[PDB]
Design a protein around this ligand. Structure first.
Ligand SMILES: N=C(N)NCCS(=O)(=O)O
Ligand SMILES: [Cl-]
Ligand code: NA
Ligand code: NA
Lengths: 539, 108, 118
C-alpha cells in the first residue's frame, strides 16, 4: 500500500477542476434546460441554487476531500461513517453520468466526422435522410406550418435516426456505436495516465474551448433577431415558477454542472495539500463555471432568436426542447460563419475537449473512490489496468442502449433521472445535513480553519445548515405534490414502464444512503442508541 | 523552525522622515501569512499590518507594508512622535509559529 | 468590546507548575482560536501554544512541546495554560492572543502575567 499522492503543484488542482466541471453541462445542457423552461424563468432558481447551494456544496465536497484525504466513499469515514452511503450514492450517480455524458461525446464525434465535407450535411436538406417537408431555412419565409429545418432533420434523422419512442429502440446505429467506442478508447487511454499529465494541457484545455465559446458568442450576438432570443433568455415568466419543473431543472443543473453529488470533487480535493486555501480557488472556479454557463447561454439563445426570426416561428418552438438543442442551434450558427467547415471542426473539437476533460475527471473520480474503497486490491499496477478497462467496457456496453435508433428516449430518461434528478437533491441535502447537524457547522468550520486558515463565513454556515437543506427538501417535496411526468421535446409522453425505469435509476442513486444505514445498523453490535452513537462517531 | 531574521533592533530616525525595516525569513512565507505587530514601551503588542499589506484598525495610512516570499518590509511615510515602539514580524502559516526579532524605533 | 484579561502569573520554583487563566469577554470565545504568546525580559516575542475553537487542534512550540498544556473553558469563556517542569528559560511576560483567522493574525492581545522562575 503506497502512500497517497498529492497534486505536487497548486495549479494541478485548478486545471483538474476547470477541466472538471466546465464541460457539456455549461454549453449543452444549461441551454436546453433553460429553453425547455421558458428561458427567463429558469435563471431565478438557477442563481438561487447557485448562491445558496452550488458554491456551498462545491466547497463542501472539495474541503471534505482536503480534510479527509480520501475520495468519494471513504471520505465519510471521518465525517460520520453512518452516512457512508452518500459516497456509494455518489458513485452510482457518477457511473450513470459517465454513461450518458459519453453518449453526448459520441454525438459530438459523429458530427465531427460529418464536419469534414465542403458542404455541411445540416446546412441544406437535399439528402437521403430528409423528409419532403423541408427546404432551406432562408426560404422558410417565402413559401406557404408543418415544415422542418435541415439542421433538425439532420439531428433527428442522420445522427439520432429518431424512432417512434422508447418502446421501439430500433437497430443499433453502427456509426454512433463506433463513435462511442472511439471516444471510450480516448477516455481509457487517458485514464491510462499516458495523456493529460502534460504541460500542454493549459493551452489545450483552458485556452481553446473558451476561445471557441467567445467566437460562438460573437457570432450569435451579431445575428439578426438575437435580441429576441436574449429577451427570451433573460426576461422571466413568473407563472412558470409555480411549476416544479423549473425549480428541479435549475437546481439539478447547478448540482450537475458543479459535478457535486459525484465524489469527483471530493476526489480532486483529496489530492490537495492539507494547509492549502481551497476556498478562494473554489470561488474563482465556480465563477468560471457559472459565467461559462451564462455566457454560452447568451450565445446559444441569441442563435435561437435568430433562428426564430429566420424561420418565422416562435422562439420556444424553433428547435428541440430537449437534449439536442446544442446540436441544432450551434451547428446552425456555424453554418452562418465564413468557411463553416473549419468552424464546424473547431466547434466539435471544442465540445470534445470540454466533454472529454470533464469525462476524464469524473471517470478518474469514480476510479479514485473505488480504489480508496479497496487499497491493495486495486494497486497502481496491473489491476488498475483491468479494472479501468472493465469500468470503461460496461459503461460503453450500457451506453449502447442509449445510442440506438430510439436512444434519445433512453438518453433523456438517463439525463432527467439517473444522475440529475431528485437523486442530486437527495445526495446534496444529505451531505449538508450530515455536515451541519451530525458533524456540526462549528466542528467542520474548526476543521476548515485548521487547514484553510480562517473561519468560513455565515454564507457557508447557513447554506450547509439551512439554505441547501431547505432548497433540496422544498424542491423534492414540491416536485411530488405537483408531479408532472418526463416528456421528451414536449410531444413524446413516456410510457409508465419507462418512467418507472427512470425512477429506478434515480432510486439506485438515491437508495444507497438508507440501505447503507440499514447495513451498518445491522452489522454493529449493541442497542440502537449505541449503534447510532458509534456509527456517527468519526474514525 | 521558520526563523525570521529581522532588521537590527536599534534604529534611530528624526520625526517626519521616511523609514523602512526588513524581515528575512528562513523558509518561504505565503505573503498572506506574515503579519506585523507594534508594541509600545511597557505595553502589550497589537496587530499593525496583516497579510503584509493590509492595515489593522487604528493603524494610520502613513504606515505601509510590502514584500513577499522571503523579504518583507514595514514602511512609514512620515514618522510622528507616537511611532516610538518595537515592531515584530511574524509568519502565522507554519504550525510552529515564530515571531521576528525586535526592531526598536527611537527618536533623536 | 473584545477584552482579554490574564491572571495566575507569579514566582515559581524551577521544575514547578503554574496555571494561567486568560478571561475572555465581549466576543464569542468558542468561535476563535486562541494562542499563548510569551515575551522574554530580553523583549523577544515567542509563541507558546495555540488552541483551536473547540480544542480539537492544539499546537505547541518546540520549547514547550511536552510540558505545556493549553485548554479552554468555552462555557465560562476562559482560556487556560497549565505548565509543568518549569525550567529557567521560561521567565517571560505571558499574553493570550486571539488568533483565529490565519490571514489576519493575533488581532486582539491581552494584558500580561509576569511568570518568574527562581
Ligand atoms: N462532467 C460530467 N460528467 N458532469 C459534470 C457536468 S459538466 O462538466 O459538463 O459541466
Ligand atoms: Cl450551469
Ligand atoms: Na458546468
Ligand atoms: Na471539461
Amino acid at each position: 500500500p503506497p502512500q497517497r499522492e498529492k497534486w505536487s503543484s497548486k495549479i494541478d488542482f485548478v486545471l483538474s477542476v476547470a477541466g472538471g466541471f466546465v464541460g457539456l453541462g455549461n454549453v449543452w445542457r444549461f441551454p436546453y434546460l433553460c429553453y425547455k423552461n421558458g428561458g427567463g424563468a429558469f435563471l431565478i432558481p438557477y442563481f438561487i441554487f447557485l448562491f445558496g447551494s452550488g458554491l456551498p456544496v462545491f466547497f463542501l465536497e472539495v474541503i471534505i476531500g482536503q480534510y479527509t484525504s480520501e475520495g468519494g466513499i471513504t471520505c465519510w469515514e471521518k465525517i460520520c461513517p453512518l452516512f457512508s452511503g452518500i459516497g456509494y450514492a455518489s458513485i452510482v450517480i457518477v457511473s450513470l453520468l459517465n454513461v450518458y455524458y459519453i453518449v453526448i461525446l459520441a454525438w459530438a464525434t459523429y458530427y465531427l466526422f460529418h464536419s469534414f465535407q465542403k458542404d455541411l450535411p445540416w446546412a441544406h436538406c437535399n439528402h437521403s435522410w430528409n423528409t419532403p417537408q423541408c427546404m432551406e431555412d432562408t426560404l422558410r419565409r417565402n413559401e406557404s406550418a408543418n415544415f422542418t429545418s435541415p439542421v433538425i432533420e439532420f439531428w433527428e434523422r442522420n445522427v439520432l435516426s429518431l424512432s417512434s419512442g422508447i418502446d421501439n429502440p430500433g437497430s443499433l446505429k453502427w456509426d454512433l456505436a463506433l463513435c462511442l467506442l472511439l471516444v471510450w478508447l480516448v477516455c481509457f487511454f487517458c485514464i491510462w495516465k499516458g495523456v493529460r499529465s502534460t504541460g500542454k494541457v493549459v493551452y489545450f484545455t483552458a485556452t481553446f474551448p473558451f476561445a471557441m465559446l467567445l467566437v460562438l458568442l460573437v457570432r450569435g450576438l451579431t445575428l439578426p433577431g438575437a435580441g429576441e432570443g436574449i429577451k427570451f433568455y433573460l426576461y422571466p415568466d413568473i407563472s412558470r415558477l409555480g411549476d416544479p419543473q423549473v425549480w428541479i431543472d435549475a437546481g439539478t443543473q447547478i448540482f450537475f454542472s458543479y459535478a457535486i453529488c459525484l465524489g469527483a470533487m471530493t476526489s480532486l480535493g483529496s489530492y490537495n495539500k492539507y494547509k492549502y486555501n481551497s476556498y478562494r480557488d473554489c470561488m474563482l472556479l465556480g465563477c468560471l463555471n457559472s459565467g461559462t454557463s451564462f455566457v454560452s447561454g447568451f450565445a446559444i439563445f441569441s442563435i435561437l432568436g435568430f433562428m426564430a426570426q429566420e424561420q418565422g416561428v416562435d422562439i420556444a418552438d424553433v428547435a428541440e426542447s430537449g437534449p439536442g438543442l446544442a446540436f441544432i442551434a450551434y451547428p446552425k450558427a456555424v453554418t452562418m460563419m465564413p468557411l463553416p467547415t473549419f468552424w464546424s471542426i473547431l466547434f466539435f473539437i471544442m465540445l470534445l475537449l470540454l466533454g472529454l476533460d470533464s469525462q476524464f475527471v469524473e471517470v478518474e473520480g469514480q476510479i479514485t473512490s473505488l480504489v480508496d474503497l479497496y487499497p491493495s486490491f486495486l494497486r497502481k499496477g496491473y489491476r488498475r489496468e483491468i479494472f479501468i478497462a472493465i469500468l470503461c467496457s460496461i459503461s460503453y456496453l450500457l451506453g449502447l442502449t442509449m445510442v440506438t435508433e430510439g436512444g434519445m428516449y433512453v438518453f433523456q430518461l438517463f439525463d432527467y433521472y439517473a444522475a440529475s434528478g431528485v437523486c442530486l437533491l437527495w445526495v446534496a441535502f444529505f451531505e449538508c445535513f450530515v455536515i451541519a447537524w451530525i458533524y456540526g457547522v462549528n466542528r467542520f468550520s474548526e476543521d476548515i480553519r485548521d487547514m484553510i486558515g480562517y473561519r468560513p463565513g455565515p454564507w457557508m454556515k447557513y447554506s450547509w445548515a439551512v439554505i441547501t437543506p431547505a432548497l433540496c427538501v422544498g424542491c423534492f417535496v414540491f416536485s411530488l405534490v405537483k408531479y408532472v411526468p418526463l416528456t421528451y421535446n414536449k410531444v413524446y409522453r413516456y410510457p409508465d414502464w419507462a418512467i418507472g425505469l427512470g425512477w429506478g435509476l434515480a432510486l439506485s442513486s438515491m437508495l444507497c444512503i438508507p440501505l447503507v444505514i440499514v447495513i451498518l445498523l445491522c452489522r454493529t453490535e449493541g442497542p440502537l442508541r449505541v449503534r447510532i452513537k458509534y456509527l456517527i462517531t468519526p474514525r | 523552525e521558520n526563523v525570521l531574521t529581522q532588521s537590527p533592533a536599534i534604529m534611530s530616525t528624526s520625526p517626519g522622515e521616511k523609514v523602512t525595516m526588513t524581515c528575512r525569513a528562513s523558509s518561504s512565507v505565503g505573503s498572506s501569512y506574515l503579519h506585523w505587530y507594534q508594541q509600545k514601551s511597557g505595553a502589550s503588542p497589537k496587530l499593525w499590518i496583516y497579510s503584509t499589506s493590509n492595515l489593522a484598525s487604528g493603524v494610520p495610512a502613513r504606515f505601509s507594508g510590502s514584500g513577499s516570499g522571503t523579504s518583507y518590509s514595514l514602511t512609514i511615510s512620515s514618522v510622528e512622535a507616537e511611532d516610538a515602539a518595537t515592531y515584530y514580524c511574524q509568519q502565522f502559516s507554519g504550525y510552529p509559529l515564530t515571531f521576528g526579532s525586535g526592531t526598536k524605533l527611537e527618536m533623536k | 468590546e473584545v477584552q482579554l484579561v490574564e491572571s495566575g502569573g507569579g514566582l515559581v520554583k524551577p521544575g514547578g507548575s503554574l496555571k494561567l487563566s486568560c478571561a475572555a469577554s465581549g466576543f464569542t470565545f468558542s468561535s476563535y482560536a486562541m494562542s499563548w504568546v510569551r515575551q522574554s525580559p530580553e523583549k523577544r516575542l515567542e509563541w507558546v501554544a495555540e488552541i483551536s475553537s473547540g480544542g480539537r487542534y492544539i499546537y505547541y512550540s518546540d520549547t514547550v512541546t511536552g510540558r505545556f498544556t493549553i485548554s479552554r473553558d468555552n462555557a465560562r469563556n476562559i482560556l487556560h495554560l497549565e505548565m509543568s517542569s518549569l525550567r529557567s528559560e521560561d521567565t517571560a511576560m505571558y499574553y493570550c492572543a486571539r488568533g483565529e483567522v490565519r490571514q489576519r493574525g493575533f488581532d486582539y492581545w491581552g494584558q500580561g502575567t509576569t511568570l518568574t522562575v527562581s
